Amino acid sequence: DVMDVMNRLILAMDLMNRDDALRVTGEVREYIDTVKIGYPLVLSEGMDIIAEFRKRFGCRIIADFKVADIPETNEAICRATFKAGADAIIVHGFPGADSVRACLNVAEEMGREVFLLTEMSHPGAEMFIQGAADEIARMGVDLGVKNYVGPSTRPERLSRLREIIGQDSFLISPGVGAQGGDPGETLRFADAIIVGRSIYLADNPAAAAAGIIESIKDLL
Amino acid sequence: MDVMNRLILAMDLMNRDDALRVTGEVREYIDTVKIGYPLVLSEGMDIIAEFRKRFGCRIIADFKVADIPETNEAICRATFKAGADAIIVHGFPGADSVRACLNVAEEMGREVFLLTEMSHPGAEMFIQGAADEIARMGVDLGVKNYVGPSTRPERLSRLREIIGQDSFLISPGVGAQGGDPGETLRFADAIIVGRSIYLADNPAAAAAGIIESIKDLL
Ligand SMILES: O=c1cc(O)n([C@@H]2O[C@H](COP(=O)(O)O)[C@@H](O)[C@H]2O)c(=O)[nH]1
Ligand SMILES: O=c1cc(O)n([C@@H]2O[C@H](COP(=O)(O)O)[C@@H](O)[C@H]2O)c(=O)[nH]1
């Protein structure tokens, strides 16, 4: 009972121009039915961009807003985001259990989903997040979180996070391609990989997506 | 940064009409407004320019920036394009993520505020134990503007100690979350106040009342 992500591949659509974002997403639509829309695009083009993607592509939308405020403000952010049509929202765990619970409560009321971001993929994640990440994941399990985000760039950490959350939980993983993570290796542990620049900066985004999928064909 | 009455309005109403009306009602008391995602995600980034057109106030974009460096850069660019004077960034994701924001702020003539410890109970779980180190990281990176919690004055005082008297420190959690205006201003340069003003029956009277209570500190 998890979202059915086509080809185990989620597009990170971080282009900031509406025309470019729509063009590239349309070009890879035959390969991907799940799109992650973040603040680069939303802050540039408005929350209606979620509406426009739904209208144009009929793709699931994960709002990557890394929600990281106090409970009251988290609640408001989730309400606005789901009102706009996002299927799911990504929330940081490091601000603690009350902040996460606030998001879960809105998601439950509104019939949508929360993804909990545990450890991040970039080098700076080692300073503070990494040391808290196993406990953040365990906290997620205790709170009944079913969907998680963890880093492609650290296979050993991604493996441990998978263990903590169990095989029934849903796990998606960014850092594939541009940041150095390998698609196949990452899919040993993650249900789906998130890929941005390797696709959307390619001369032919469809060929780039098709190439990634070909490389993991035996895992589909 | 010179904040009128040491008081920053946290404008978290999610309706444009109410947000503009309430801000107008307290305009004589403030010249600095913190705008966050509740308002921006409901009404659009154009609300920032509208506030600058109507009030001339400085605008702090409270976006709790907490992504990887590449994405942080993009978020800061979009935010400053919309006319924000400053942006609030989480320190927990580490130094490279903060530096990405500092770079864009320098390029566009803006300021970064580094959020160290947060004001809500959940901050005790992970953030509090990292907060002193996050503040030292800010010092190492040349950060001059910081955010810390009204709800824990002993922690706010420690943050002030780490960053020094020359750094600028603003503090939320005043009023609704339990923090005291005057006590907070022992350590912070300015207090952030949301619900105590914008949910008050009479927001202007609420603002005036807070200012009366700290008049000897102005
Ligand atoms: O730990 C994380 C969590 C993320 O959401 N992301 C997001 O995943 C995407 C990665 O894109 P890319 O494939 O271009 O590196 C970006 O949108 C980024 O904000 C990440 O890179 N690392
Ligand atoms: O630690 C923090 C950091 C914040 O930015 N904030 C923000 O400050 C404001 C506090 O508003 P209020 O006075 O209604 O509690 C909110 O916009 C909130 O998101 C906070 O409450 N605690």
Curated annotation (Swiss-Prot), chain B:
Keywords: Decarboxylase, Lyase, Pyrimidine biosynthesis. PANTHER family: OROTIDINE 5'-PHOSPHATE DECARBOXYLASE. The keyword Electron transport does not apply. GO terms for molecular function: orotidine-5'-phosphate decarboxylase activity. SMART domains: OMPdecase. Belongs to the OMP decarboxylase family. Type 1 subfamily. The keyword Lyase applies. Coiled coil: none annotated. Substrate binds at residues 12, 34, 62-71, 119, 172-182, 194-195. Pathway: Pyrimidine metabolism; UMP biosynthesis via de novo pathway; UMP from orotate: step 2/2. InterPro entries: Aldolase_TIM (IPR013785), OMPdecase (IPR014732), OMPdecase_arc (IPR047595), OMPdecase_AS (IPR018089), OMPdeCOase_dom (IPR001754), RibuloseP-bd_barrel (IPR011060). Catalyzes the decarboxylation of orotidine 5'-monophosphate (OMP) to uridine 5'-monophosphate (UMP). It catalyses: orotidine 5'-phosphate + H(+) = UMP + CO2. One of its GO terms (biological process) is 'de novo' UMP biosynthetic process. GO terms for cellular component: cytosol. The active site is at K64 (proton donor). It comes from the Archaea. Its EC number is 4.1.1.23. This is Orotidine 5'-phosphate decarboxylase. CDD domains: OMP_decarboxylase_like. It holds the Pfam family OMPdecase.
